Design a binder for this molecule. Structure first.
Ligand SMILES: CC1(C)[C@@H](O[C@@H]2O[C@H](CO)[C@@H](O)[C@H](O)[C@@H]2O)CC[C@@]2(C)[C@H]3C(=O)C=C4[C@@H]5C[C@@](C)(C(=O)S[C@@H]6O[C@H](CO)[C@@H](O)[C@H](O)[C@@H]6O)CC[C@]5(C)CC[C@@]4(C)[C@]3(C)CC[C@@H]12
Ligand SMILES: O=c1ccn([C@@H]2O[C@H](COP(=O)(O)OP(=O)(O)O)[C@@H](O)[C@H]2O)c(=O)[nH]1
Length: 471
């Protein structure tokens, strides 16, 4: 504890994995250790500089992959080809990332599971390495249970998470493609010294800290929700990217509405719905009759469209009825969710949007799409009971307009009203969300669960540093 720790963080160029890992590095920075993010210049611009907080940037190889100069992240990508370029750009940056880390070795490396070449880098440098995927520990347990007990290849439809601490049924089977990409990353990540989770034990469940530790044989570190590291308005409003609309424009409009009278609809980054699907969402939004903040990244840069191009995805007269805000880009989600007017959230069950909703105490309407979201759907609705389900069952591998099954407006509206109409069910769901909200307020504060986990994590990293100094 006499000298601080030198920690490097290598976040992947994805909004869901860049945002949380930098906030997690800000928790290390608040303790007095020298953190350092290693990413591209555009992704490091939005990062507020704390104490000890520094970045090391290598220029994004735009013309090497074939991208415009303004695209250095997966959130600005609207095509499956773009995700390949973001990955290929990460392969080219692998050279200079390894060289910089070899020239100035840190006390510890924290790297994403999407980059599995950090294993050789930390090994030859004989330094402790931490893995990060931004999933829930509950989901990580569920995906390692399917890896030990594979589903029959023919089987499809709902399935039970095998040999779990709690009987849980996921609504659809994962794609066979998902297994071939995920399993190599989990195996390399399990070769790491520890796993960093942007969650707290009161939410994932202690029976899964004991499941991951004793059944799988690996250490996890509940350090989140790291979104709580941003306290001011400017810290909450600038995340990953500058907001598209003025943050005060949202607040002045939300301040005029009642409490729990606004629905926030955002399927996160990397999810783009076809125009038919957006039409069903829009029809179900106006049919519910509730004010809404709808994030539509599918139509960013497509403002003042001709009447033909707008009727492809919106009912005629939808924008004339000013009962909501259609944001075609980044939204201050921490700000919008924090406002007392938002009382419901239509989510893709992404983990960042999930813990941010638990902090703000907003119940969630679940619409999972890919990745860890179909496990998160059941963590929201069955395990913790802070949300209702739409009832979707399409588990795509790519979400870039790839969905082949149309979710009807009668299905969406039915779920929207189950939380906005204030029924007897919705009342106690919002009570269980407020119970977790009060707990979440001080899990990163002194004495909390995730706070003390970071205290233990630092001490063990300091120990390993003191052992290397002997040699
Ligand atoms: C196969 C390919 C298209 C890949 O192309 C290959 O590249 C290698 C490079 O050496 C070559 O050797 C091959 O010949 C070939 O060209 C490029 C892109 C790519 C890698 C994958 C990809 O970009 C992302 C995912 C992604 C992984 C995962 C675990 C995430 O964590 S995504 C992440 O978090 C959440 C998760 O829900 C997202 O919502 C966030 O926005 C953020 O992106 C799960 C989801 C997903 C989409 C699974 C597929 C893949 C591994 C993908 C698209 C497979 C295809 C692959
Ligand atoms: O318009 C948007 C879209 C996304 N986000 C942020 O992007 C992250 C989305 O992460 P999540 O894991 O929920 O979705 P994923 O990016 O994995 O699809 C969260 O921090 C959101 O607050 C935001 O602030 N505004």
């Amino acid at each position: 504890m006499d000298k601080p720790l030198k920690l490097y963080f290598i976040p992947y160029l994805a909004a869901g994995h860049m945002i949380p890992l930098c906030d997690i590095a800000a928790l290390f920075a608040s303790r007095g250790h020298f953190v350092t993010i290693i990413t591209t210049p555009l992704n490091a611009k939005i990062l507020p500089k704390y104490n000890n907080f520094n970045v090391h940037t290598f220029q994004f190889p735009s013309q090497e992959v074939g991208l415009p100069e303004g695209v250095e992240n997966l959130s600005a990508v609207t095509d499956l080809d773009g995700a390949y370029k973001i990955y290929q750009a990460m392969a080219l940056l692998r050279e200079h990332i390894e060289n910089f880390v070899e020239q100035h070795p840190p006390d510890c490396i924290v790297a994403d599971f999407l980059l599995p070449w950090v294993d050789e880098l930390a090994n030859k440098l004989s330094i402790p390495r931490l893995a990060f995927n931004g999933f829930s520990l509950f989901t990580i347990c569920a995906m390692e249970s399917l890896r030990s007990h594979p589903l029959p290849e023919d089987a499809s439809g709902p399935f039970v998470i095998p040999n779990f601490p709690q009987d849980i049924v996921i609504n659809s089977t994962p794609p066979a493609e998902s297994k071939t990409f995920m399993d190599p990353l989990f195996t390399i990540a399990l070769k790491s010294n520890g796993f960093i989770i942007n969650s707290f034990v009161e939410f994932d469940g202690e029976e899964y800290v004991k499941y991951y530790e004793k059944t799988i044989g690996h250490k996890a570190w509940h350090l989140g929700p790291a979104s709580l590291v941003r306290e001011t308005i400017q810290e909450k409003a600038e995340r990953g990217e500058k907001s598209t609309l003025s943050v005060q424009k949202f607040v002045d409009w939300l301040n005029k509405k009642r409490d729990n009278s606004v629905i926030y609809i955002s399927f996160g980054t990397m999810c783009h719905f076809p125009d038919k699907q957006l039409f069903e969402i829009a029809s179900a939004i106006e049919a519910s009759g509730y004010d809404f903040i709808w994030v539509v990244p599918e139509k960013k840069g497509k403002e003042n469209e001709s009447e033909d191009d707008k009727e492809k995805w919106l009912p005629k007269g939808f924008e004339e009825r000013d009962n909501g805000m259609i944001v075609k880009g980044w939204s201050p989600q921490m700000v919008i969710l924090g406002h007392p007017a938002v009382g419901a959230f239509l989510t893709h069950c992404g983990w960042n949007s999930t813990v941010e909703a638990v902090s703000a105490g907003v119940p969630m309407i679940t619409w999972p799409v890919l990745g860890d979201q179909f496990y998160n759907e059941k963590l929201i609705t069955q395990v913790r009971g802070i949300g209702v389900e739409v009832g979707v069952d399409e588990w795509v591998v790519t979400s870039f307009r790839g969905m082949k099954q149309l979710v009807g407006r009668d299905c969406i509206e039915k779920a929207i009203r189950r939380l906005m109409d204030g029924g007897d069910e919705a009342i106690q769901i919002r009570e269980r969300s407020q119970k977790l909200a009060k707990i979440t307020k001080h899990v990163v504060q002194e004495g909390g669960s995730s706070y003390e986990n970071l205290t233990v994590l630092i001490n063990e990293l300091k120990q390993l540093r003191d052992c290397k100094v002997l040699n």
